[PDB]
Design an enzyme around this catalytic site. Sequence first.
Site, PDB file in Angstrom:
ATOM      1  CG  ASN A 239      -0.155   0.180   2.508  1.00  0.00           C
ATOM      2  OD1 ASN A 239       0.839  -0.499   2.710  1.00  0.00           O
ATOM      3  ND2 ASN A 239      -0.572   1.105   3.356  1.00  0.00           N
ATOM      4  CB  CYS A 241       2.219   3.496   4.797  1.00  0.00           C
ATOM      5  SG  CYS A 241       1.473   5.147   4.669  1.00  0.00           S
ATOM      6  CD  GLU A 243       0.403   0.034   6.541  1.00  0.00           C
ATOM      7  OE1 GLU A 243       1.175   0.635   5.776  1.00  0.00           O
ATOM      8  OE2 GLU A 243      -0.722   0.478   6.834  1.00  0.00           O
TER       9      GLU A 243
HETATM   10 CL   LIG Z   1      -3.050   2.467  -0.169  1.00  0.00          CL
END
Ligand SMILES: [Cl-]
Lengths: 520, 520
Positions: A239, A241, A243
């Site tokens: 995604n 970030c 994670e």
């Molecule tokens: Cl996302």
Amino acid sequence: TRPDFEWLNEDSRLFLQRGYLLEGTTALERIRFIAEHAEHKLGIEGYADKFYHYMARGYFSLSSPIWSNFGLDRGLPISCFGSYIGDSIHEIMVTTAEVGMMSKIGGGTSAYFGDIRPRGSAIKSDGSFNFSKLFDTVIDVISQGQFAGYIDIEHGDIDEWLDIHTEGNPIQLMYYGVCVGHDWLESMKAGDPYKRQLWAKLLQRKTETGIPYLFFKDNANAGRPDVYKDKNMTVHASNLCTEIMLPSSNDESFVCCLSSMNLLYFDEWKDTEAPEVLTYFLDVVMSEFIEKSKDMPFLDRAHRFATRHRALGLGVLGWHSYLQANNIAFDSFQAMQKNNLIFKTLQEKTLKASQELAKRFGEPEILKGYGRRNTTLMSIAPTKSSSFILGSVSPSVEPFKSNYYYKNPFLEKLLQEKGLDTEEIWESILHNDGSVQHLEQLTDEEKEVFKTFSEISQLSVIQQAAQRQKYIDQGQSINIMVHPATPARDLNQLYLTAEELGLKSIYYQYSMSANLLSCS
Amino acid sequence: TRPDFEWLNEDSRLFLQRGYLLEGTTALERIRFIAEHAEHKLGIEGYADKFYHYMARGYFSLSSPIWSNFGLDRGLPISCFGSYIGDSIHEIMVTTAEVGMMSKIGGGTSAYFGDIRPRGSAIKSDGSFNFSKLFDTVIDVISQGQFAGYIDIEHGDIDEWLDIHTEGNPIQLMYYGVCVGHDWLESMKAGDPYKRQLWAKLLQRKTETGIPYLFFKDNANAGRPDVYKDKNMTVHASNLCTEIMLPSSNDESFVCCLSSMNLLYFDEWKDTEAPEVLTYFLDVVMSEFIEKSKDMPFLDRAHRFATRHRALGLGVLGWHSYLQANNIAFDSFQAMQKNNLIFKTLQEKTLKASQELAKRFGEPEILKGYGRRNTTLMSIAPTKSSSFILGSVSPSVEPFKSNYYYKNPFLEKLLQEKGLDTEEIWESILHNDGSVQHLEQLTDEEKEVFKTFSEISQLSVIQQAAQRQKYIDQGQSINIMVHPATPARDLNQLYLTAEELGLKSIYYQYSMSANLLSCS
Ligand SMILES: [Cl-]
Ligand SMILES: [Cl-]
Ligand SMILES: [Cl-]
Ligand SMILES: [Cl-]
Ligand SMILES: [Mg+2]
Ligand SMILES: [Mg+2]
Ligand SMILES: [Mg+2]
Ligand SMILES: [Mg+2]
């Protein structure tokens, strides 16, 4: 001793008023509404007061979409949205409209570009980089945007993607990640000159910009829950970030929601139902997303995903805070013991809660016969704003940037016990980038406990992430901080070690102003 | 005397092979297939041989989408696609996906931006120009694109749109048109200083770039068929080439198909069924679009429009050719007589055909009780490639650019009758930009007949368009050609006269190298 809502000080109230709360709703009023709304949707007597109590004790951080939108008409309570781009204009437009709608609504978006045929393919195609221009424009034009595109390192268009963010390049706004396989890296390490030069260029780009993100796709797929292995549900990408570790396809776009346990208070809540209560909460949050998205134009793939998977992403913050409260140095054997204990405890408690939820509410379609409600339970997102709100604790699993940038309250206490809590001492710390390593008045042991992110072994960051990964069914947003004088050779080994140890991703490589990579 | 398919010479065959025909299909084979496929879909015995005969005599030009795609799996046979952009991200994404799908398929696209709230409106919005960046990128990224956006001159964002195509401006690829009302122009003429400066800037932009297009919205709406007036179906904008005059809305995107009568042969086909046969053909072309679009992702608004309206756009080419074949000067009373005769004849014959079609196949939903099959029948599109294919006749209603740029066959004949058909004479014509006005050997009468577009009264172009407009239920793509030394004052009056005389649009203002605007 600690009052209820100590965390909700004037800084936090102001931050919440200015960012998340509707005019005329107070922070406390909002928390009560969230607790009661969750109880109502769960149908569980006494739930609200339990959730409220844990909020009161500072055990829970809630995501900004939940603070903003949960139980209200506006927006959505999800924190990621990940699309698979099929190799057709139709499927490219489907993804374009998803990203547009989500850039208005908020919560970040991402997509996988690697199945788009490369520049020069017969249809002659302009390739995957050409289509990335569309998404970069969508987020330039529509806001609440932030978008990350993922491309495989073996893709025909990799050289075009590696110039993203360079002077004059069409792509300046969107981020990107590169998907790097085990066999590709073994070929590179065994001496392949093309792979060696490409890898060198990627590392050069990451020193210069912080990015691309790294997605170790074979570690991500080897680490999937059995259900996804059983059903060939590939994780193509992560995604915004880095994670999240969920499958996207022609028919499904991954979504997930998050909230976080405050590890500062681990020794308080470890034998309570707090993690279970938070898991129950995240499941009702997903029920809200499902209800809201059912008639939302262009979100059918995400609605489908949420309905069938019910993936959750319960995270943490305050790791370094917990270590400092116990006088433990970040890079230590004792830290590793605590890391194992904490994440083992969380894995067990969240899974138990998901099993109870399936007994109460049923298994969604993907999990029929699997015995839980949620395909995934845990992910370690970044928590910079959430950590601020919750007592200015340390972010996620990251070390504190520094001791004074905000004064470290454990350092403060230590300085007070030595009669060194003076403007001259603090100014010296501020002038040394929040470091205490210069201070002769502190023992080496004390100095060790208050090393800054920049002073800490980056190998220890990677090793701790590797250690806790066995207890986390999704991934972890892992930043590192590296001196610009660092030889490329040393960065090379650190990232290779990351892949070797089973890390599924790396996020940003931060810099600083002019043994930490190879020893712990 | 003239052989069948004289028009289909080696130039035309090559052009068709290289542009439109699938490898291994000849031009003649394609024409036969089109004729037979149309007969099969109409269920009318003898139709194919009638259509084939008229093709053979050079009476019909078919659109490039029809040549490319009619009766085949690939593409669509439509020549415009016009969307209404509602004031919401959802509706902006609907239009984005339409434009994407149509940019792949081809046939040009356009949209109306004027109901998007302007920059600074509360939601604060970034306005309509901001969203135009999305469409400009779509066509940069996806091709087979060409797109035209329309904005009202009174819109909050008009100043931003007026810098489209300027150095560094975000918008370089898409075209635009400006919708200008009667009352706005009367306020400007009566002395309003803001309107006077804005109008001056628009005229400056048009001299410099050729654009914006002008859409005289009150003339367009006053000229709609009764059915659209009866049902408040507003024409917000025109199409890529400015000849279409059809309503678009939240639920419908206009589409239309075209083919053209060759006016060179008017005196041959005026009392035949050729225009009726071509009308029947265009109706089956729309039936194909309807069948193909019914399951095409993102084209639901166009499918709906075509189903309910069945709008057609039968046009013309070879106007100047017809005049020259009859030794008539373009700017003359006799030309005006022929203009009235030709367009009156076409209006009557196409309407008759649409009435017969409703008796045979039924009225579509918008026309229940109205007594014809098609909401509109006629529009005068540009025909540069189509004119080339069909014997190098003059384009649409436009004068020939020049006599030698290709040798004018009527000039050639005249030069042969005077023994002046020599390389020296022709080279002199080439050196004078295809003009014969320098040649002492020609009478003033002969010189008049062979004036170039640049030498012709541009007032006559406008007046002829105004005259034939009463017989045309859609519009006309009208270009003008103006010397760069022309005072702004004179351009101003020409465009104001255009609106006063009832023209629904103006297309490009062409330039040339360093009384024609005010006399005819
Ligand atoms: Cl996302
Ligand atoms: Cl499983
Ligand atoms: Cl169009
Ligand atoms: Cl009517
Ligand atoms: Mg209740
Ligand atoms: Mg793959
Ligand atoms: Mg048949
Ligand atoms: Mg209007």
